[PDB]
């Protein structure tokens, strides 16, 4: 039980930025791998509590309370409320970087006419804010800050010259690359420690590799 | 099994129009309403394919011919390879009216998206079958979703619909609006029960054809 006795919060699922009631913006994530290590966390002995975004279909993990959010901001006003309870931060959400700079109240009908452009409003940064939080000594509770990433590579530099940046700019304790995993086929692993720990996520199924990051946590908790 | 030697067409669900590699435009249907009508129409004696777009999560009825989709140019080249065969069109998907006009190979890395219409799938179809590229087509069908606002009712914007769009029926949400005229209320019992109000009054006007 080598989690035993830690309050664990976890973020997972795609945000939603509504156009209006219909329509919106979003990121191609299932929420299944965050849910995967939550699961975990719980059978190592955690306290868990899930916000999670979009992901229905899917069975909630057993001892877990869960919360359920929409669109971005919903996640920063869900995560800034339960945050100073954690011992732990993991946000294996995809969240919106924008979203529309107006919404409808009501559905906006298919015009004949040339197809207006939709203007964007940058949404707040969460993994930001609570390095941020903890810094300014307003999270005497948390020992641990993970964030997840997803990087392809440009021409500028591979998918992991990318992530050292990140991992510098957000100033998170570990950073999850290329990290989720496939149980059918077609469906660069990195664990990135802020130690310059530049450890590999094998190729495998979300269990395993939600195992390797609990696992992989455990051991800068007991470094701490 | 009234539907017996009868090949069917369904969509249901949402397309998904992509932005980059990760992001992308959307709705937020949830498929159960074509879902239940493949299912009901199978356990008639259909010939069914299910052209099916994004869902929470729903199992692939059985018996029923799948087809996976994402984009909704995925769901038109879908539909028509599949239509000519077919004796009636279910289009209960909640296709995407425009796509992005440039689609990033990779992530963009971190403001205004312009924007293209996408082709009426339904209305593509129902002149085709004017047109006699479809002496197959007996049946048409299309579904509002409609919130309203101070232009009319909920009720009365798709009265429009039904003449705009020409299909042989068209299906409010709970009402039902024949080609005749004919205008039918569905009691919000199960969208089993909806789907089987419908597929009665599909069945309704073949024989009054
Ligand atoms: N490009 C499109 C979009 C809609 N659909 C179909 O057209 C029907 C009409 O649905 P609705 O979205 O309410 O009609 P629209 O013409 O898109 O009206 P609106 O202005 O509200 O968007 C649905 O069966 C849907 O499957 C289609 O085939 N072609
Ligand atoms: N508004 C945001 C966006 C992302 N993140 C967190 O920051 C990390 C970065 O995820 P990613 O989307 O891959 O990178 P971006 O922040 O969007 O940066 P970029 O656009 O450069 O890829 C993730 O852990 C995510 O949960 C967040 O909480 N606040
Ligand atoms: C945008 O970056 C992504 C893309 C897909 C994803 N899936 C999951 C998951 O939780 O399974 C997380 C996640 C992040
Ligand atoms: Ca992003
Ligand atoms: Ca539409």
Redesign the interface.
Same mark, same amino acid.
């Given at each position: 039980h080598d989690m035993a006795g830690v309050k664990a919060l976890v973020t997972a699922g795609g945000t939603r930025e509504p156009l209006d @009631?219909?329509? *919106? !913006?979003? &990121?191609?994530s299932s929420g299944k791998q965050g849910y995967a290590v939550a699961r975990v966390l719980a059978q190592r002995g955690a306290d868990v509590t899930l916000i999670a975004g979009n992901t229905?279909?899917?069975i909630d993990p057993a001892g877990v309370e869960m919360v359920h959010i929409g669109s971005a901001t919903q996640l920063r006003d869900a995560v800034s409320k339960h945050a100073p309870d954690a011992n732990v931060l993991v946000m294996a959400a995809?969240v %919106?970087? *924008?979203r529309p700079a107006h919404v409808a109240a009501?559905?906006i009908?298919?015009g004949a006419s040339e @197809? =207006? =452009? !939709? #203007?964007?409003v940058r949404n707040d940064d969460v993994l930001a804010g609570a390095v941020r939080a903890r810094a300014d000594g307003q999270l005497p509770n948390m020992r641990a800050i993970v964030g997840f990433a %997803?990087?392809?590579? #440009?021409a &500028?530099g591979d998918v992991l010259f990318?992530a050292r940046a990140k991992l510098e700019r957000k100033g998170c304790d570990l950073l999850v690359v290329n990290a989720v995993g496939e149980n059918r086929a077609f469906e660069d692993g990195w664990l990135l420690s802020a130690d310059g720990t530049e450890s590999a996520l094998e190729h495998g199924s979300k269990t395993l590799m939600a195992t390797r990051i609990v696992d992989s946590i455990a051991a800068f908790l007991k470094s701490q």
């Open positions: @009631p219909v329509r *919106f !913006i979003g &990121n191609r229905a279909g899917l995809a %919106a970087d *924008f009501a559905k009908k298919k @197809p =207006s =452009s !939709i #203007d964007l %997803a990087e392809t590579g #440009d &500028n990318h």
